[PDB]
Amino acid sequence: QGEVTIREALRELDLWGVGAVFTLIDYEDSQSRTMKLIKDWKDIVNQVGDNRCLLQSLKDSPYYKGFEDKVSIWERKLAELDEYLQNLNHIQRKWVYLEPIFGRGALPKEQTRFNRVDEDFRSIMTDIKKDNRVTTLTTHAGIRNSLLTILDQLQRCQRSLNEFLEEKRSAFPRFYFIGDDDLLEILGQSTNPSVIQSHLKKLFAGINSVCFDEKSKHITAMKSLEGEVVPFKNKVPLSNNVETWLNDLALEMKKTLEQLLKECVTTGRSSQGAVDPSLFPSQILCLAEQIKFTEDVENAIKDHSLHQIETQLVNKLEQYTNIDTSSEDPGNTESGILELKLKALILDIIHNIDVVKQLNQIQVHTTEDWAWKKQLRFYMKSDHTCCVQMVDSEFQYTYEYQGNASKLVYTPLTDKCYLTLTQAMKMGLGGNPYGPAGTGKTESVKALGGLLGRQVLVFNCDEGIDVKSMGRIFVGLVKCGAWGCFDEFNRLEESVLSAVSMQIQTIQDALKNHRTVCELLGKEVEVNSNSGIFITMNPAGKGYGGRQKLPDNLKQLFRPVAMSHPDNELIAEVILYSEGFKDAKVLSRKLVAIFNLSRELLTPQQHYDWGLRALKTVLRGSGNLLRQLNKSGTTQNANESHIVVQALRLNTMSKFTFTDCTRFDALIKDVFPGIELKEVEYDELSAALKQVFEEANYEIIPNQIKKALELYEQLCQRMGVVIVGPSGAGKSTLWRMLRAALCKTGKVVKQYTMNPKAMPRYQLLGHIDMDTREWSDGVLTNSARQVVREPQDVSSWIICDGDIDPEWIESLNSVLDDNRLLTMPSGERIQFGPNVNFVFETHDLSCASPATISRMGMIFLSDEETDLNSLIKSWLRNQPAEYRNNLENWIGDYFEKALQWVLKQNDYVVETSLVGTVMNGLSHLHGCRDHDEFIINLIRGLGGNLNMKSRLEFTKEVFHWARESPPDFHKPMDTYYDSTRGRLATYVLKKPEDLTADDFSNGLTLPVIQTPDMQRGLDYFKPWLSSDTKQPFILVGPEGCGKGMLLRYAFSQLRSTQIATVHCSAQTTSRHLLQKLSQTCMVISTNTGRVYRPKDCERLVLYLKDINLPKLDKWGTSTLVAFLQQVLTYQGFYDENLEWVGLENIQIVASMSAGGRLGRHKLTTRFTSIVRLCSIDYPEREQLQTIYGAYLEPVLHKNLKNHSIWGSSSKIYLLAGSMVQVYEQVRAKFTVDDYSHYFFTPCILTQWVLGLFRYDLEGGSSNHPLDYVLEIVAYEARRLFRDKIVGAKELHLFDIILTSVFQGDWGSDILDNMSDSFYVTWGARHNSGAPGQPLPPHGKPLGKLNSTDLKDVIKKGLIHYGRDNQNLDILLFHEVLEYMSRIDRVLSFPGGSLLLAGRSGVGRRTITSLVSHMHGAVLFSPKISRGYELKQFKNDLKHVLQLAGIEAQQVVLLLEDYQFVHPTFLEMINSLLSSGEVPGLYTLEELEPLLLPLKDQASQDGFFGPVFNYFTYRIQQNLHIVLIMDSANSNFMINCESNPALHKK
Amino acid sequence: RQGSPILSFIILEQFNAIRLVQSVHQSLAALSKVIRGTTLLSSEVQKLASALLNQKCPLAWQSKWEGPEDPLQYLRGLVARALAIQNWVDKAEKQALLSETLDLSELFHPDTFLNALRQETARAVGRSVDSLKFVASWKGRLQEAKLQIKISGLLLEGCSFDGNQLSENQLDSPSVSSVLPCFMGWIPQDACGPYSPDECISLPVYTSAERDRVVTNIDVPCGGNQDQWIQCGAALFLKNQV
Amino acid sequence: PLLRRDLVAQGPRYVVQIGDKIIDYNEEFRLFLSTRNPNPFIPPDAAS
Amino acid sequence: IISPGADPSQELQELANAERSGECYHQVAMGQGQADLAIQMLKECARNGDWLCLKNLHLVVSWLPVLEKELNTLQPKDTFRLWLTAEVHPNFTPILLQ
Ligand SMILES: Nc1ncnc2c1ncn2[C@@H]1O[C@H](COP(=O)(O)OP(=O)(O)OP(=O)(O)O)[C@@H](O)[C@H]1O
Ligand SMILES: Nc1ncnc2c1ncn2[C@@H]1O[C@H](COP(=O)(O)OP(=O)(O)O)[C@@H](O)[C@H]1O
Ligand SMILES: Nc1ncnc2c1ncn2[C@@H]1O[C@H](COP(=O)(O)OP(=O)(O)O)[C@@H](O)[C@H]1O
Ligand SMILES: [Mg+2]
Ligand SMILES: [Mg+2]
Questions:
Q1: Where is this region: AAA 3 (chain A)?
Q2: For residues B129 and A597, is the Cβ–Cβ distance under 8 A?
Q3: Which of A54, A1173, B96, B218 has the greatest number of C-beta atoms within 10 Å?
């Protein structure tokens, strides 16, 4: 009786309410004032988060119920409160910055803007100064709108500042690569320490932090991130103008470095070794040593080869390696740092050694010999300003602080690199190092900027960044005298490139001729002579993927380099020795081999990488160990050898399939025989992890644990990580479990999930509005900012659970690079610490460039690693288990081979990962009461997926396996359990009584015959539909199958709920769904964010008519599916405006054609394995006799039920017998392949039978009766088919077919020759004969007219048309009659539209004009203007629809080839036909006025729920469409196939 | 992979090959069915016929295996190998594969095959596979190699080969030049070569004249006059049509 | 609409469609026109 | 007509200098948004009698009619010339080619 607990919780929750209050703190201004303001925000908000999450935690307990009403209070109030709260700190922090700023830049008209806000803020602020408590803040009135309006004002004042911010970036250039958002903070709050420290690094390369004098007026020193403290020779003057002191910092930093160097060097030139390791920063040491090298050498060569100098250096090195162990003792030294600054310097030496060593073999003749000029040389000029020279190129040194960041090991490749680059810089050209992936070429430039000392910016060229947006960036670089490398310059819009080349050319010309000023964007910019431009691009590779070919023009502005092969074994040993690992040379060789060999003789997986990036990591992998191992125990031999392998097996073991996994391990033994093995050791985490699976009620399976555990250190290893496998592999769950287990010991996990493909490119990445030139975030860009603010001791993970395209993903290259940084195209950039991990989940990496693959870590799952028997167990626990006993026993033995057989078969309707298949099998099996039932339900589950004939094979064998062969002898498919009788199975036909024209009144809700198929489709649905048992699923069957028909029925069975439909196409997109959903569904707010809810429905359902159609990107993923993918998975999506919205209650459902025909694209496994599905096929001719037999009866019995030949219910069934006979023969002989539009389906049988209503079969007189009734049948038939068929010979062929069946089945030539006669609307009994705006349900009735009689009648129309329009000498002849007769029938029918294809001049247009005029149909054709536009057209359409939909007058909408000034039109028409609606045609507000009238009309008519659908319906009845097109036109055939609806409708 | 590692490779090849064969077969059966019988083109078979008449076999196939551009020329190769392979396997189940002469024309991953001996030799020789190095010799058979191979149907362009030397090609001479079979295998580093170091010149062994990619490169008797061979652009192509 | 005799009868006179604009077709009006390039262009729609 | 490895901008740079001086020569590389400005550049330099050069026309093929239209319009000054860069692109308009 545990309501006690929850009651108690609530009580203390309630007690909290009043207890809640604030931390109010005073503050003074630029316009000195004093205000109380909030502190420790986060502390306060956490309250909310925690309590709210508590609430929802409570919601799940049963005992919740009793106290439900109180929960709503708090849920509401809190949900609202977080919103209010959250806003306010933004407001506060913005004011903090802007008020100082609006104090100084005082344009009174801008001040109005801000002052109103200040006023507005302070105003309600004081309500809280006064009222200290928090709960009150919801009590304040209109605060919602207050807050929201404010922020909007702040948005707008910002815009004024835009002009201003750029003038401040001109005033100081490093700003160009910082966000405005941040910038104004610094501009506004120049004084503020925490602002300073938290915004300094991002401005300046070197400096994490700075020391502060106690006075906070000045600064004595600066810190590296690493902690390396550096003093300042001259103290820093803090000043009120930010740029004024900033500029001074730069220069004082430079002067500090400048003097600091010479001080150091002068001690070192003297024989006494400088050795001020403590005094000087490793940056300077290396440099100072490197000139010592230089001077020595030039004095050296003159004197002697001076091997003695070499030996000196070997002793120096030797000295240092011994000190390496003396740097292990200090460890985490008190007030100590830079022992790794030692490791830095080591490699310079060793490069130098191998440099000299080669020179000694040359026995070089002179000081200024060439192989020395080759070498990279340093000098302290007599001007006391350093200079560095290579060959005849020399450059002055900028003295930018780099601070301690590993420099890459020199290598032969780098010689070439550097030299070509230096040469390029001599040429005043940029340098283009290109190569394959994992080459190292990006990092090279970066380090050469370091050795040369410039400040280096990294960029990532993506998203086709605006030429203008490049321009400014250049403008920024030039002034700074910085070095700008672009990483992946390749991937950029070709039009951009070319224009940018012009930008480059002008700049180079300035550098070369040493022009002080450069002109670009119409701007003269004082350009630093010390600037550098480089681009690092993979070739536009076969493998590489989506990257744009470069103009030759542009190429010339660079000097290329080939970075394709990098020596590794060199690099390999070096690092080990930098660690101080002793057997370096021996082991380095081994690794490289292991790699190359693995790569050589192991299965060449897509996803494997033995590229450099993998290797680079293994080396840190050991440096970590060696760093730990010396501390725990003292050093020894066997270990060192032993240790590398662990460091290796980290990178390795994830990827490997078991087979390969084993093969690799064995390989290691060979090259490292003594070492044997050492498994993963750590259990602390596994324990927590083991715990969670039990708490999540997931079954514990070893591999899962392994992979997760494996995953963990993989995450520590590298920034980005991948999870690969088919859906249901478990991969998504995997990481989800991890965080939980982890979180128990592991302070934090922050989760953000992009399904990147679901939303558009920009939504993800963020962009620049081209007009305003204002930035607007992207999801991950935004999320980055959320994670950077996040405290140091927090984990932050960004998940991308979606398919992969090099175009979007490769934009993270700078992020997942050795360098961890994310680059905005505005220039803003966002580094990350080890806090941050990144995660990708994906089906496969087919489209992956190697760049990305090697860029990040990775884990692999197969069917092998996926455990099925293990997963079924959890299904059993899910069941009540009243029958669970029975089921374990049944399934255990029965399931497997039945499974097997289907896998053997591999003949099935859609690709689903096993799980996918399995699951379908299982989800059908719940609740199965008897064994007998279970058999049926089993087969149900699986046989959904089989192509029909192979279904039989299955079912059959199931009874071989099962006890008995099925009761149904033939069509054992048809077997249905009897729930009450327990009587196994058979299927039945159910004849309905009531049938009349009433039942057939509507275009839909058509009375549906219930043959066996029916009862099968329903039985195979219904479990998944109803309430608790709910599943999302699909129906597959060829068009005309009946899917639409069946579903409609199926839904009606359900009482709870409403049915939202979508008629899909290529152009169908997410927002179409937003809105079609929004129409019938709620917009509400709850705890855990907003959500969409069904309105006034217990449940809601989404039906999607054709999923295939939405267009696939080149990489082959429709974003629409990807959306749907996200939705099922994460019950929610990212609203534009970057909100994340859930969906509280919707089943999702789809229909589709089997993938056969052209352009019905097929859908990713990710989505398909997620859901349930099944297939149906046209009823057999035997069954189709029965449909129409019963659909026929009413039409015949309405009139002349008695007449001899008719009634005769066997003679009725006969008709069905023959038409169906015709039906088949014509589908056999004519197909899509003959002509696109040859579309024949039972829909056509229906269109043919129901078409018969229109004809006056009264036969008030006693009937022939054959020739009266049958010519009609013939004439209709002929109208449906023969009209459509193109060729003379094919028509001839058709006629034969027709005639044959008729003769055979009834008399002979009851066709006869009725060529003289036309049945038409003009001329019918009951005097139908214009007024008559609302059409008959089955259309205008039709009567029989002669040619000669008709010829008169047309001229009657021509006369009366001559009054309204131009008169015409239009002649009549049989064809014209025929033409017009056929159109009349169409236009009389509601929703009836035409497609008139023929050669110009035999006018569709002249005949069509008339008919409509004579109908009284309103006839619209758009007037085309030079301003043809989507605007014209939308208006037009809107107008037309308005007419037919509101006014109800019959309307012809007409279009000719010439009218289609924009391809999109047709997609609209295409949609319009199918659905009677068009997306983004109306906006929601527009509807209110339009449909208001219909609100009553509809209710009188009898309709329930959303009116728009009524509107639609109405449209469809009175709106007819016509299109004239030329067979000759090239895209004629195209468009027909493009817009399926076109020939279908 | 079986207990003995060389074989593992060939069974693999056996399988992966047959897998391709049957992918091709299905992409052939499909298009075989529309012409004579009842089918509706999908975008797949729509893409198949595009390949044939552009005269370039599909990226569909060439993604799986880099084959010759001419689609027929592709098939003839694909097939001829497929069957040969079955013969290789036969000689292999019986541990009899070393003993014959094997042309590497047949293999899809001949390099990998080569690197498969590298294991089997070290198995027999009990050595870290990093320790071995590879060579061939026309002047007889390799003594210090625990296991060897006789490779025929190698072919050469731009220089002429006679035992122990290479010569210049005369005008008349077909660009293509048949080359004598090798003896091949794996041998200790820092052990005596079959040829002294300086006499032989390394040459690539390309998959075709197109010569996009390489199987391996071999050292071959300079007979002095190193540059002329390079300027000759001498190279070796493993096989044509197989 | 201009190339076709797409004229509508307004009493005695005949008015003609141009974009939104309706103009009286002056019966003396005749048109001729040219291009420096053969193709482009015409559609078979326009050839007629 | 450019081919791979072909750059005339340098030869022209030199000829500009050689047969003229005064920085009369001005140039534009085609790309996003340039087309509207190019007209002005053309118009201006045509009127001036200075040399103007336009690059990579093959990229922006749709433009050309607008260009050639204006070219039949525009009024030269003696000593004014037009210089044009194009990769091989079909559908490149015959009128201007003429
Ligand atoms: N430890 C476990 N024991 C039993 N069942 C599990 C376990 N972990 C996951 N499952 C179930 O396995 C199925 C598949 O797991 P998961 O959803 O992770 O695949 P996935 O990575 O999401 O594939 P996709 O992302 O393509 O959908 C789910 O239905 C899940 O409930
Ligand atoms: N059991 C049935 N009873 C009545 N009509 C059927 C039946 N099965 C198929 N039809 C006919 O076939 C067509 C099925 O079309 P429908 O299912 O609405 O579209 P789709 O096949 O494209 O999903 C209908 O026009 C219907 O008259
Ligand atoms: N029976 C006819 N007698 C005389 N002229 C005709 C006849 N049918 C068509 N035309 C000519 O062709 C024109 C109608 O062509 P139209 O219907 O506009 O062709 P389309 O519909 O193929 O574009 C008429 O204005 C007339 O000049
Ligand atoms: Mg890079
Ligand atoms: Mg998932």
A1: 997-1251
A2: yes
A3: A1173
Any idea how long chain D is? Answer: 98
Look up residue A1178 and give its DSSP letter.
P
> Experimental method used, please?
X-ray
Residues forming beta bridges with residue C25, ordered by sequence position: C14
Say if residues B120 and B145 touch (Cβ distance below 8 Å).
Answer: no
A1032 assigned ligand-binding residue:
no
Q: b/e map of A1499-1513 (b: 16 or more CB within 10 Å)?
A: eeeeeebbbbbbbbb
As a whole number of angstroms, the distance between CA A9 and CA A2 comes to 12
Query: Could you give the CA distance from residue A1017 to residue A1047 in angstroms, rounded to a whole number?
Result: 9
What is the sign of the dihedral through the CA atoms of A1391, A1396, A1401 and A1407?
A: negative
Cis peptide before C41 (omega within 30 of 0): yes
DSSP assignment of A380-426, as one string? E-TTS-EEEEETTEEEE-------S-PPPPP-HHHHHHHHHHHHHHH
Cα separation, A847 vs D14, whole angstroms: 46
Closest partner residue to B115 (CB to CB) among A594, A601, A671 is A601
* Separation in Å, CA of C37 to nearest CA in chain D: 6
Tell me which residue has tokens 């002055």.
A396
Helix axes A307-326, A282-303, angle to 10 degrees: 160
What is the domain extent for residue A1427?
1181-1545
- Relative to beta strand A796-801, strand A558-562 is unpaired
Query: Both tokens of residue D9?
Result: 């901008």
Helix (H) or strand (E) holding A529: none
Alpha carbon distances (Å) from A178 to A168, A286, A1440: 12, 31, 52
Closest CA to A938 of A968, A908, A915, A918: A918
Resolution of the experimentally solved model in angstroms: 3.4
Phi-psi region of A1451 (alpha: psi -120 to 50; beta: other; left: phi over 0): beta
Q: Are A1166 and A1125 in contact (CB under 8 A)?
A: yes
**CA A1064 – CA A1042 distance, rounded (Å):** 17
Contacting A residues, span 709-728, partner chain C, CB-CB under 8 Å: none
- Burial environment of residue A1387 by CB neighbours within 10 A (0 to 12, 13 to 18, 19 or more): buried
Q: CB of A971 within 8 A of CB of A1015?
A: no
Q: Mapped to the 3 state alphabet, what secondary structure does A656-672 carry?
A: CCHHHHHHHHHHHHHHC
A-contacting chains (≥3 CB pairs under 8 Å): B, C, D
Chain C: partners with 3+ C-beta pairs within 8 Å: A, D
- The set of residues, in sequence order, having a beta carbon less than 8 Å from that of A762 and lying 6+ positions away, is A463, A778
Ligand 1 and A871: CB distance under 6 A? yes
User: What 3-state class would DSSP assign to A562?
Assistant: strand
Question: Residue B202, Cβ neighbours under 10 Å: how many?
Answer: 9
Instruction: State how far the Cα of A1342 lies from the Cα of A1416, in Å rounded to an integer.
Output: 17
CA distance linking residue B128 with residue A668, whole number of Å = 9
Residues 6+ apart with CB under 8 A from B118: A601, B129, B132, B134, B186
Cis check: omega of the bond before C40, within 30 degrees of 0: yes
Residue A1484 is part of a domain; what is its CATH number?
A: 1.20.920.20
**Min Cα separation C32/chain A (Å):** 20
Query: Which distant-in-sequence residues (6+ apart) come within 8 Å of B231 by Cβ?
Result: none
| Protein residue whose Cα sits closest to atom 16 of ligand 3 | A1403
The CA distance from A1270 to A760, in Å, is: 57
Question: What counts of helices (H) and strands (E) characterise chain D?
Answer: 4, 3
Between strands A796-801 and A750-754, the pairing is parallel
* Nearest by CB: A1457 against C8, C17, C43: C43
Indicate yes or no: CB of D2 within 8 angstroms of CB of A493: no
